[PDB]
Every structure is written in C-alpha cells, then in structure tokens.
C-alpha cells in the first residue's frame, strides 16, 4: 500500500536511487474521437429511428393525442395540503442517511475525471449507476445547502402528486376518478412514503416517479395504439433502472410493458413487417448504453462491479428477508414512519388482489390500468430481492405505486364495491392493526435529523402506548364485525349517512393522513424543542 | 470534557471549589481530573474553513455543506487536514464503510496521518454528542505533494492493466 515514499535519511541523493511506481491510472479516462462519434451519431440515429416510428400511427390514421399531451392543470384544497406537506417537509423534515455520501461524491466528481465511489471499493466508479450524480455535481455549482440540493427532489414530489392525481387516477376508472376518498387515500399513502423515505439525494425519488412515467407512457400508448409511447416508456424504465442499484423495481413497470407491446405491435402491425416496428424500440432499449458507458469502458465497469461485490457488502436474492427483518427493529429503519408506509401498501395491495379475485377486477375500476398497477407493484416487490444491500430506506421506490394503490384500495373498500358491512368492518380492523404494529417502535429518524423529535428513541405513548390503544380498537372493530356476521347488517340500516360515518368508510385516508400529520408535527416539534 | 454552562453560576459567585467524592471499592469505578477552564470557543466554520481539504465521514455531509472534502487527482488523493465525524455510536457502527478492508479513505489516512482530537461543543445543546472533530497531522511533515509524471496513452475496450487487489 503506497501513501508516498518515506525516508528518515537526508542530504544529497546518489545515482542508483530510482523508485518508479505506475499509479493505477484506469477509470481516469476520456472518450476517443471514434467512441464520441458512435455516441453522438448513434443517439441521433435512435431519434431518427424513433422519428420514423412516430409517423407510423399518423400513417395508419387518427387525430393527434387527445389527453396524453397535457391534462388541464390547476389547484384543489387537497393539492394545496399535499404541496404544503411537501414544501414544509423540505425545511422542517428529516432527510435520507446517504444524501451526505452522494453530495461529497458529486462534489469531488469533476476534478476526479470520473464518478468514483469516494468512500469505498478502492476508488472504483459507480460504473452503470448514478448518472444524476453528474447532474447533482453541476447543481452544487449554484449552492450546497440541504434546501438547494434537495430542491429537484422537492419538484419531483410535486411532479409525482401531479402524475398520480391527473394522469394515474383519471385512468384507473370511473369510481377512482369520481371518489374523493380515492384521491385522499392516494395523497395520504403517497405522502406516507415520500416524506420519511424520499427527502434527499438518494435515487428513490427519481425511481418512484420514473415507475409512474413508464406506466403512464405504456397506459397512454396502449389506448392510442401508438408504438412511440411504448418506446418512450422503455427509455424512462432504462434510465430509472441505472438511477441506482435499487433501480430494478423499474423492471416491474418494464415487464408489464411487454404484454401491451405485443398487443400494440400485433394489432397495428397492418402488414408493416416485424423489422419496421421493432428495430426503433430495439434502439430505444440500447439507447441507455450511450449514457451508462459515456466515460467508462466495458472491461472497466464489469471488472469494477465484480470487484465491488467481492470486496464490499453484497447480499443474495434469498437475503431479502433482512430488508423486512430491519423494518421490524426498534431503530430508525424500523421507525413508526417506515413500518406504516410498507405495512399499509401491503394492505392496499392485499385488498386489491383479494377484490380482483372475488370480482373480475375492482368494481368501479378500468380493467387494464388497475391490473397493470397491481402487476407493477407485485413484480416490483419481487424484483427488489435482487438488490446487493437490504435497507428499509429503499421502500421509497414504492412512493409512486403507493398513490395508485391508495386510490384502488379505497375504491375496492367503498360501500358500493365491498357490499358486506362485516367485510368492511374487518378491513377497518386490519388498518387499525397495521397502525397498532406501526406504533410498536421509535419515532426515530436518523442522524442529525433525530434532534429533539417526539419519541425519537421511545414507543409513542400517551397514557398506555399507541400500539396497545390501536390493538384494542382493532379488537373492538372485530367484535362489531363479528356482531354483523350474526346480526346480518347492510349499508343502509346500521346508521343514516352522516359525516362521521362517511369518514369511517375511508379508513386508509384516515390512517394515512393521521400519520402524514404526525410525522410533519413530530419534525416541526423537533425544531421547536431545539429552540436557539 | 465534563461540561456545565456559565449561566448555571450566579453573578453572586466569584470563587470556585472542585469537589469530587468517590466510594466504590470495585476495581473499575474511579475518577481522574484537571483544573477548570472557560474555553476560548470559535465556531467550526471560521476554524476549519471551506478551502482546506477535509475527511468528511459519509454520514456528516448535508450537515457540513460549506467545508470541502479532499478532491482526488489521478489515482492520488488530496491529504485531509481535518476529520468531521458523527456521534460515538454513529461512527462506532458506520465508520467501517471506509475501513481498509472496504478500501475507503479511513484506510489511507490510517497510515499517512496521526489523528489528534480537538474538543468541540454543540451551540446551546451543551450535553448532546453532535459528533467529533479531528486534526490530521502527517507523520513526516517535511514531506509535501508528489512529483506526478503523467502522460496521455489511448487504450482498448476489453483492456485491463493489472488485477484489483482484495484487502485480506
């Protein structure tokens, strides 16, 4: 190991003394004129290939995109409260544990001549991952402040609510589009994810929003029989995959795109030949290899990745149990905030699966969109098992699909869809229980973000502990549910359509908002308790 | 550093007595002491700067945005002059990211520099372990940055110079 050349001898130096160490100069490279040629030519060639594919529905006939360009953007009381939480968090709320690592990595990025992992693996690069680190490096030039650096992440959260509320939910069905509880649960669950898991420089926000854009592009290119939006989705999916290693959740959105691609390519094939419609999408796939390998050579990246695995912490597909075992720790990774997010998305997913089994799809739901949202969530959760490290702060990848499942679960559990009162009661008992289980930790955030926050290292308790009170209410709901099972109760005779009743039939929006408030209140009350 | 504030002593008092009882005969309960001090404190920002290369732990980053980490040259690193680090447990459990086994800077500095701990205090939260600050002094201070004889040479795709060495 060389840290220089040290001698405790001094004076004149004689002939013979020659130390000639060749420094490991690899990774310190710049593209050859030939490598830059194929890149600029090849990436323009792809736009030329995709431009040729764009005119193919315009050649098959039809009016220009009717809803896909821009849906009428505005405000709503909910849109305010969402962005209020988003913007307030940006100042008072807790950031990710790695935003420091990423910052200092991007900070030294420029002089280095490449994207080296600064703190580990003998200065080997990020190789396929962290392309936006180069973008964060440029952004640092303006300023280096939690508020400045996390600002694209603030805009991403806003862009995210936008995509969910205006592109996802209207597409999800009539009951989704019309139900206000579906928009309240959608915001409630999305914020329960975005706030604790995505307030920082980690790739999670980029992926969480990237999986929504992939879905939207397919979803909108499937309804318009246009292949270009399916090819656009591929590019969004390819970019989010190489966002960070946690990018594989994007495989969820991608694999699901296969089904509609064979549908769009076989219906609009109109005797055009496979080579004419597939070559531009094959180009759209490979187009990220220009970005991934913009500065590093195949050998460099491959050799570095095979090393980074050997040397540092690398885990297996069958190790994913750790990720969930970490989630149940009385720690910042097992925090109320983090337990609740996951636990509730699982409940949302479960009631959505269960409904799609009893009935063909969720009653007031659009067939294709809903199935593809559950699809992307199932595939995403499984895809996650392949990550080399099993942290809970990775659940922030689910932030997009959380909103979409919030909408679906609410619609699936409404009086009209879920007809049994007893069944709606047990579902409520489940929402109470995930929260009972969520309040069985510490309200803890990690690092300097844990300063004087309420119950930062204790079980949130007032006079008996939230976990016990919630479990009791959860058992109370079951006895009410069991009473309906023997009494034979319906939607109309139990109580007469009041506001308190109205609220109770949307338990996810109640539970999720309850927690969104609690988390913002807790980190405000943290700053408050750290007075001067 | 045993800490208590100047505000906790009234303007009425002018002389101070350091009393310290002990009564455990057990082998490891015991106490050591030094004369009192009113520390001449200057904030970290004005002391370390933003032009001095520092070894910012991967944890302390968005917290110390002003202070600059040591840039890395062409296989060589800028020698850090300071080390900002998280709280006791936070470094006890998160510092192994940079250990020699992992190939991190904490392994390069482990050989080149001698780490002297400079005492530090949190703004008004006197009793909170905010973290720690270290002054990093080289073993051979007469020694200064290397004579890097670097030159351009284009290389192939599949090309690899030497294998990457795994630490123990």
């Amino acid at each position: 190991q060389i840290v220089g050349v040290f001698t405790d001898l001094s004076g004149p130096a004689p002939e013979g003394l020659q130390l000639s160490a060749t420094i490991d100069t690899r990774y310190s490279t710049s593209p050859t004129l030939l490598k830059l040629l194929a890149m600029i030519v090849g990436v323009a060639m792809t736009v030329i290939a995709l431009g040729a594919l764009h005119v193919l529905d315009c050649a098959d006939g039809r009016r220009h995109k009717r809803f896909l360009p821009s849906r009428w953007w505005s405000m709503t009381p909910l849109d305010g409260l969402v962005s209020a939480m988003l913007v307030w968090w940006h100042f008072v709320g807790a950031n990710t544990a790695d935003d420091g690592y990423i910052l200092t990595m991007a900070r030294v990025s420029e002089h280095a001549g490449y994207m080296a992992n600064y703190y580990r693996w003998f200065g080997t690069p990020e190789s396929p991952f962290g392309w936006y680190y180069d973008l964060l490096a440029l952004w640092a030039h303006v300023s280096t402040a939690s508020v400045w650096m996390r600002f694209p992440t603030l805009l991403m959260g806003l862009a995210c609510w936008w995509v969910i509320s205006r592109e996802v939910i209207p597409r999800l069905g009539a009951a989704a589009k019309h139900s206000r509880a579906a928009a309240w649960t959608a915001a409630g669950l999305f914020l329960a994810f975005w706030l604790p898991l995505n307030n920082g420089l980690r790739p999670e926000p980029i992926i969480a929003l990237g999986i929504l854009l992939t879905w939207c592009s397919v979803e909108r290119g499937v309804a318009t029989s246009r292949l270009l939006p399916v090819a656009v989705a591929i590019i969004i999916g390819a970019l989010t995959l190489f966002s960070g290693p946690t990018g594989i959740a994007a495989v969820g959105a991608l694999l699901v795109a296969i089904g509609p691609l064979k549908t769009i390519v076989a219906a609009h094939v109109s005797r055009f030949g496979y080579w004419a419609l597939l070559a531009p999408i094959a180009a759209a796939g490979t187009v990220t290899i220009f970005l991934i390998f913009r500065d590093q050579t195949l050998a460099a990246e491959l050799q570095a990745s095979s090393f980074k695995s050997a040397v540092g912490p690398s885990l297996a597909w069958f190790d994913e149990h750790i990720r969930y075992s970490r989630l149940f720790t009385t720690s910042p990774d097992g925090s109320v905030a983090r337990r609740f997010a996951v636990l509730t998305l699982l409940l949302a997913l479960a009631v959505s699966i269960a409904m799609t089994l009893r009935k063909g799809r969720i009653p007031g739901t659009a067939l294709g969109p809903s199935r593809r949202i559950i699809g992307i969530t199932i595939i995403s959760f499984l895809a996650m098992m392949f990550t080399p490290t099993k942290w809970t702060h990775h659940f922030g990848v689910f932030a997009g699909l959380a909103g979409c499942l919030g909408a679906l679960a609410a619609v699936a559990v409404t009086t009209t869809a879920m007809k049994s009162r007893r069944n709606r009661t047990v579902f409520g008992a489940a929402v109470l229980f995930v929260t009972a289980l969520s309040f069985a930790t510490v309200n803890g955030w990690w690092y300097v973000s844990n300063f004087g926050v309420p119950w930062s290292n204790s079980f949130p308790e007032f006079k008996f502990g939230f976990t016990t009170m919630l479990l009791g209410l959860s058992v109370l709901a079951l006895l009410v549910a069991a009473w309906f099972h023997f009494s034979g109760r319906d939607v109309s005779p139990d109580r007469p359509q009041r506001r308190w009743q109205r609220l109770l039939v949307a338990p996810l929006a109640v539970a999720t908002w309850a927690l969104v408030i609690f988390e913002v209140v807790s980190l405000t009350l943290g700053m408050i308790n750290q007075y001067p | 550093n045993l800490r208590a504030p100047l505000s906790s002593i009234p303007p009425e008092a002018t002389q101070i007595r350091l009393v310290a009882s002990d009564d455990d005969l057990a082998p490891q309960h015991w106490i050591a002491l030094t004369p009192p001090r009113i520390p001449e404190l200057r904030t970290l920002q004005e002391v370390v700067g933003s032009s001095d290369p520092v070894m910012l732990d991967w944890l302390v980053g968005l917290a110390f945005p002003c202070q600059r980490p040591f840039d890395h040259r062409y296989g060589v690193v800028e020698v850090p002059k300071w080390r900002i680090l998280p709280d006791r447990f936070g470094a006890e459990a998160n510092s192994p990211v940079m250990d020699y086994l992992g190939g991190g800077p904490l392994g390069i500095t482990e050989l080149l520099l001698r780490p002297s701990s400079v005492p530090t205090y949190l703004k008004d939260d006197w009793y909170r372990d905010w973290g720690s600050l270290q002054r990093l002094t080289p073993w051979y201070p007469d020694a200064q940055p290397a004579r890097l004889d670097l030159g351009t040479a284009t290389r192939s795709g599949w090309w690899s110079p030497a294998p990457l060495r795994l630490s123990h």
Binding site: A49, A276, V287, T297 | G157
Partner: peptide, 27 residues
C-alpha cells in the same frame, strides 16, 4: 406504395442505433 417511405428509414436507423450502442463500450 403501402407507406414504405418511413418503413425503410425505421429499419436502417433502428438496426444502426442498436448496433452502435452495443459497439460503444468495446470502443
């Protein structure tokens, strides 16, 4: 005939944009 104006440029550019990208790391 049968809108072959875009059909040929989609094949020749689609295959080339793919081929160049696969070549790119080996360069």
């Amino acid at each position: 005939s049968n809108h072959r104006t875009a059909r040929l440029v989609a094949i020749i550019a689609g295959l080339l944009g793919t081929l160049m990208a696969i070549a790119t790391p080996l360069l």
